[PDB]
Each structure stands twice: as C-alpha cells, then as structure tokens.
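quick one: potassium ion bound model?
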Amino acid sequence: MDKKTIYFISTGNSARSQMAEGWGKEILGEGWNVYSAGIETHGVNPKAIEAMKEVDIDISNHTSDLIDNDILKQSDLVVTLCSDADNNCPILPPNVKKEHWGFDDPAGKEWSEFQRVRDEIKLAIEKFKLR
Ligand SMILES: [K+]
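yep, here:
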C-alpha cells in the first residue's frame, strides 16, 4: 500500500500547523506523507521552532505555505486546527475526509503556551495513529 496523505491546515501556517507537521513526520512517517498550510502565511513562529527544539525536532527547515489545490485533491485526510481554517477551508473533493482538531492559538503568549499546545498536538497525533 502507498503512503496516505494528511494535510494540516491553520490560520497562518506558523505555529499549530507547523508543530503538527513536525510531530506528524516523526509519528506518522511510516505510513503517511505530511503537509501543512494556512489561510495566510506568517512564516514559522520563532517560539514554535524553540518548542520543537526542546523535543529534539527541527522545524526551522519548514516553509509557511498557502493551501494548495493539488495537495487537497490527493489528501486522504484534511485536519483543520482552528475556526478560521475550518470555516475558510476551500471546498474539498467529494471523497476527501475532513476533521477538526481545535487547538488554542499560542501567538503573543509565553514560551509555556507553545509547550502546552505542542504537547496537546502530540497526543492527538499519537492517538490518531492508533485508531
Ligand atoms: K508547510
């Protein structure tokens, strides 16, 4: 069986979706291709990079990207991480499944908020893998 595709979408492909891609690559790497995008691109949040560094994952090489139609069409699962993404997610192909795993926006907050969200995302992806 060929690897499946999971697409994490958020508001600015800066924190939540970047950490989800980071965790996804490691946790789901054997059976999935992992991508992330945002309704807008704010670049990779510095605190999100620091947060992943604490768990020995480098996401400073990630890119902040807008939603790509080609990736959507080939996605097995699209996961929206916030209301903005969920409400503004472009129309998906009829056969593509979509789920909303909401996480708080750590933007403008202390280091600790990124640590908290980082780990809530980790748990969600770990559970997903064991479905
Ligand atoms: K990306």
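The radius of gyration is 14 Å.
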